[PDB]
Amino acid sequence: QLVPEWKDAFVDYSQLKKDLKKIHLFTNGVIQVHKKLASSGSNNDVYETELLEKIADDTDAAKEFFACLDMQLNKVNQFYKTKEKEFLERGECLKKQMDILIELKDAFKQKQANKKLSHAEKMIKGALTELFKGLNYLKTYRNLNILAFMNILKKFDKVTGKQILPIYLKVVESSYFNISDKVMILSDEVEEWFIKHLAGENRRKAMKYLKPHHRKESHSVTFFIGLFTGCFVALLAGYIIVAHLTGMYRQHSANTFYMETAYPVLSMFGLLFLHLFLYGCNIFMWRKARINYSFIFELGSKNELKYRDVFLICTASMSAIAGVMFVHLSLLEKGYSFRQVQVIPGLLLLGFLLILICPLNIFYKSSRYRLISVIRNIVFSPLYKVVMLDFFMADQLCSQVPMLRNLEYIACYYITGSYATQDYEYCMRVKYYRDLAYAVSFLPYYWRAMQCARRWFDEGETSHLVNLGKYVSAMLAAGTKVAYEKERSLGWLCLVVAMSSVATIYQLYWDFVKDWGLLQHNSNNPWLRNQLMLRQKSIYYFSMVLNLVLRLAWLQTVLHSSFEHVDYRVTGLFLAALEVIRRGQWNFYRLENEHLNNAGKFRAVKT
Amino acid sequence: QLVPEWKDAFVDYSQLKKDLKKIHLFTNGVIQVHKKLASSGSNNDVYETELLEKIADDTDAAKEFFACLDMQLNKVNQFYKTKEKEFLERGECLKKQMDILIELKDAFKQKQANKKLSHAEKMIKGALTELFKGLNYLKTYRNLNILAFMNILKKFDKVTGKQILPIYLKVVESSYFNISDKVMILSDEVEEWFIKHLAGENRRKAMKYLKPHHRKESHSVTFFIGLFTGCFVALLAGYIIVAHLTGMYRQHSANTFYMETAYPVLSMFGLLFLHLFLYGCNIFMWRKARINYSFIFELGSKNELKYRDVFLICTASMSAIAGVMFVHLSLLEKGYSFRQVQVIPGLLLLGFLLILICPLNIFYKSSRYRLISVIRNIVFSPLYKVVMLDFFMADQLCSQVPMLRNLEYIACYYITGSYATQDYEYCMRVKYYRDLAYAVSFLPYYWRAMQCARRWFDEGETSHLVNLGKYVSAMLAAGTKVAYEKERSLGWLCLVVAMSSVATIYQLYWDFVKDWGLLQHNSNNPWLRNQLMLRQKSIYYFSMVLNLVLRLAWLQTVLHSSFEHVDYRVTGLFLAALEVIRRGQWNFYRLENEHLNNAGKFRAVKT
Numbered sequence A, B: 001q002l003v004p005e006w007k008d009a010f011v012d013y014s015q016l017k018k019d020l021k022k023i024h025l026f027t028n029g030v031i032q033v034h035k036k037l038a039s040s041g042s043n044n045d046v047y048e049t050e051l052l053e054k055i056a057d058d059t060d061a062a063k064e065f066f067a068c069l070d071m072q073l074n075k076v077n078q079f080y081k082t083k084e085k086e087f088l089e090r091g092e093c094l095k096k097q098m099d100i101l102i103e104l105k106d107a108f109k110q111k112q113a114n115k116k117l118s119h120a121e122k123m124i125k126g127a128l129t130e131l132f133k134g135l136n137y138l139k140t141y142r143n144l145n146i147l148a149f150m151n152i153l154k155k156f157d158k159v160t161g162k163q164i165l166p167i168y169l170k171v172v173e174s175s176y177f178n179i180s181d182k183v184m185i186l187s188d189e190v191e192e193w194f195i196k197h198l199a200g201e202n203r204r205k206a207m208k209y210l211k212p213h214h215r216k217e218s219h220s221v222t223f224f225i226g227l228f229t230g231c232f233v234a235l236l237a238g239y240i241i242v243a244h245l246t247g248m249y250r251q252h253s254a255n256t257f258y259m260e261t262a263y264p265v266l267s268m269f270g271l272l273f274l275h276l277f278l279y280g281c282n283i284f285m286w287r288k289a290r291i292n293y294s295f296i297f298e299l300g301s302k303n304e305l306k307y308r309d310v311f312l313i314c315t316a317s318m319s320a321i322a323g324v325m326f327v328h329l330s331l332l333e334k335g336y337s338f339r340q341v342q343v344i345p346g347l348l349l350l351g352f353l354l355i356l357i358c359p360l361n362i363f364y365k366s367s368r369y370r371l372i373s374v375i376r377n378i379v380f381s382p383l384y385k386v387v388m389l390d391f392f393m394a395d396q397l398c399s400q401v402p403m404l405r406n407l408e409y410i411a412c413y414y415i416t417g418s419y420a421t422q423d424y425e426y427c428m429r430v431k432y433y434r435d436l437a438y439a440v441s442f443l444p445y446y447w448r449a450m451q452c453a454r455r456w457f458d459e460g461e462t463s464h465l466v467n468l469g470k471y472v473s474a475m476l477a478a479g480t481k482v483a484y485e486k487e488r489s490l491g492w493l494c495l496v497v498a499m500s501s502v503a504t505i506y507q508l509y510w511d512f513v514k515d516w517g518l519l520q521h522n523s524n525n526p527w528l529r530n531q532l533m534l535r536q537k538s539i540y541y542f543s544m545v546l547n548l549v550l551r552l553a554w555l556q557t558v559l560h561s562s563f564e565h566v567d568y569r570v571t572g573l574f575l576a577a578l579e580v581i582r583r584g585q586w587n588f589y590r591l592e593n594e595h596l597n598n599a600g601k602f603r604a605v606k607t
């Protein structure tokens, strides 16, 4: 079939139902099938009708039901037998045409040991490429006719309501186009010489030369998202039952080397693997509005990560912690020599540290060494000029201020010997854990404020000087809490309400105005901008109240450093996992804004 | 576009590479792009070339690289601008054509309150159905040209090896066909009146009128297979760690109400949900060889179960047991009033019993009341004439003989009050658990032998009398073990070796010969039959040695009834879960045989 040719022999879902509309106008105004084949030595399914079950007072329109329908049996059967007969004529001349190929494909290495051979390939390539697809059209011809003859009977099983839909179907399925599979013995016959010596030795390269409608997505990754989602949830749920039934869940039990050894590590991993998830719940929202994240970030093609390849990292590696922090609760239910069981926390960190810098090819290299091309520029702060993916992962760390106290308690309990010596207070005695585990905790707001300084003494403009002010603002507002542990009075307490509400507007101003681009009164939209890259004007305003409700989580988690003081712990992992949820919609409206104020639409091939 | 018309403007992956083959013959015999638009007030991307980086000794073929390629920039750009201009001409006359529709679609309910309206629908249905698809062709025109211009440069980045694949791409993506999305603002413009008043009020019915390449499979079930696979494995693995660290795993601990209360539950549910899985690993092998299981079984259309809807039952309901038999280990680690914690085993059975007979619609009704149309005929054995799905689920129970002892120990510990009265030996004192928990254990081999009796006094033939002999054979061979507990001597021990090896050939004969159809010496294949419904003649013989190796698991599990005698327990759930693995390949070669000796090919629509 060079062109698709079954035109009168297509599905006749149009013509048959308006005759079923014509018995409908006879209502106000089921059959035993006489199976006979052709008396001409052929297989023409001429089906004689019989009315028995008292349809109407005079069945003048009941024969109109079969005045056309039994011809539709023949209409497929006259064609499919002849289209098979044409494909028998195109099924045996090819046996002779590839038989002279046998004379050629036998001597090409015999006589090489002793130039039309390449001309001989196109003589059989272009032949048997679409000659297969003439059969795949013929299977699609068969399936659509079953999709015809089954689905032309929906409303007849309501206005009459019988068991005819399998009864009629067994002169359809027993007719020649389905009671045989003689086109399907050709479905493996077409690849007898195509696979082994025509296209080479491959299996996918031989498939690609003749397959349109190629292949769907290999869904061995929708499963592996699910395998590790459920393995993490059930290992977590078998940690809030067993630790409940141990005594330790409320700390009404034995030694407190649980909530100071490995709560500072199921905290640091529940916050880091909530952010990587919300980075993958934002590629699902960037692609679904075509916000072109690869060109703005200057990514490239470069093995495009998707929202199934960061939904796979954040689940496969969070069940790997919820497992190793389940075999470590068991050993601390009975006791298994504390001097060596308390490296399992500090080694799971060490296992994850080397996967990130693993140089081989396994765990997403060319997007895991690009990420160390980003946190190399940010830590060397006043140098290393800012691009868009040098700004972005520097202001994803202003939600991981509570995470960066649980990667400084750990490397105090693993670097000065506090694990083998059995002491959970070795860090928090000296001045080291009064300022320098809370002053270097505001290191991410120093890296931002020294990237705007190079974005000022570079590019010149004034707007990268009020950006610089924004992080110095939330470095004084917690710098007053440094001088609030002493002189707790009416002195530096009308100052930690002063500078901490100066900050919380000066971050709230900058979010909508100079990051999200919103709050323009000189517009056609109330409190939004002119043009929107999204649907209905209702969820825009819901995200504007959630950057103010959720910035009470911020300024609680950066003035109430959890592992330095008061032992109310679960607030330090609930509110601190709300600021990580707050940024995650800030990532959306910062990229939508700097695409609707980038004005280009460079999408490399997506859809 | 009534016909697909981009023929010279198709991907030119043919013509450009043979010119790249022509610079290849110049080798033995990269550019800064001068971006200029049209000087005629248009957007014709005429790109002037420049050679700087010293390609060859004389660059006569380097200009041949750009003698055609920059024309391919124009060839898409002259067409896409004009095809958009045609779709502007087909983008503004439709604004006027649907504007007279506004005059019609406003008065149809005003004047109804006071017949060309239906003729007006086809005036805009058939217009805007494929006029959308003219744009979906134009997006496919754009994507294939990106799929052209990216994938015409594979071998040029090896013979020269530069960074040109994103450098060249930014005069491709910045050209008018991708630097705009003016066809994509029409992608939502086509459904402004189509969705709300043309097709009605639906979302899928409005989509079906104009969508070929409709939709792939909704993969919210490849995830839910995976969610419950991992939830079962991690709840199991958090049961072989916690019970290991309890004392009870080797029974070196407290009271033995573990391995007599709930090991006869996690035994009866690890065998029943291994068989339902291997019934779904056989629909994956029946469909993949087109063995037509629905017509042989006389199924019908009738909401066709797949191998994702029995891989979903057997995983979602095995994590629901591995959960409830994990909250029941915890309560029996500390003790929570034994008189009421020991109903959780006998209620999980009761929960699963009522799901099977649940009549509403939830858990696969019309295939769960058909299954009680099967185990109603089998238990009323000598009546109820045999069809193929009355035979099949009667001889799936001759692998669940060890399962049917753990559904008779349970309903002795739940029916005569042995749970509140605290006694794990109340059943196994009287004669009740010496014969009648082992003689009614061979009830499934009685239902088979009384279906062949109605298949004899019906249909007449001799072959349904040697079938009847086959189950009476393995009813005497274990009936000698009834008389082996006494007179253990050289008496009835040259009889339990006698009748039990008479059985194990008389099942081994019937499997290959009169069920699988194999072992015909009068054939062209050694020890197989003539025609095969499968691939290479190597895995046929591997399944013939696995019905003899694995029938030592049988006759061990039906002479060594596990909860009646000797306390070696894990052999009673390893070997008994091998006979359930043995049948599971018997289901394959029994249906392949009775399709290659059914000779019809009635496939209702699959592929």
Ligand SMILES: O=P(O)(O)O[C@H]1[C@H](OP(=O)(O)O)[C@@H](OP(=O)(O)O)[C@H](OP(=O)(O)O)[C@@H](OP(=O)(O)O)[C@H]1OP(=O)(O)O
Pocket (backbone or CB within 6 Å): A013, A014, A017, A018, A021, B122
């Ligand atoms: O295109 P039209 O000639 O206007 O026909 C329509 C259309 O039928 P086709 O798509 O088969 O041409 C509708 O079919 P659906 O696509 O909605 O299923 C169907 O609407 P109802 O089924 O809601 O009535 C109705 O066909 P029929 O009359 O066969 O029901 C029929 O309209 P008329 O035949 O009434 O013109």
Ligand SMILES: O=P(O)(O)O[C@H]1[C@H](OP(=O)(O)O)[C@@H](OP(=O)(O)O)[C@H](OP(=O)(O)O)[C@@H](OP(=O)(O)O)[C@H]1OP(=O)(O)O
Pocket (backbone or CB within 6 Å): A122, B013, B014, B017, B018, B021
């Ligand atoms: O169909 P032909 O005229 O015989 O051309 C083939 C074919 O090219 P097309 O499919 O583009 O027509 C091969 O392409 P692939 O499908 O294998 O990629 C390619 O084979 P190699 O790439 O292995 O050489 C080779 O094209 P080229 O010469 O451009 O490499 C070329 O054969 P000739 O051009 O050598 O006749």
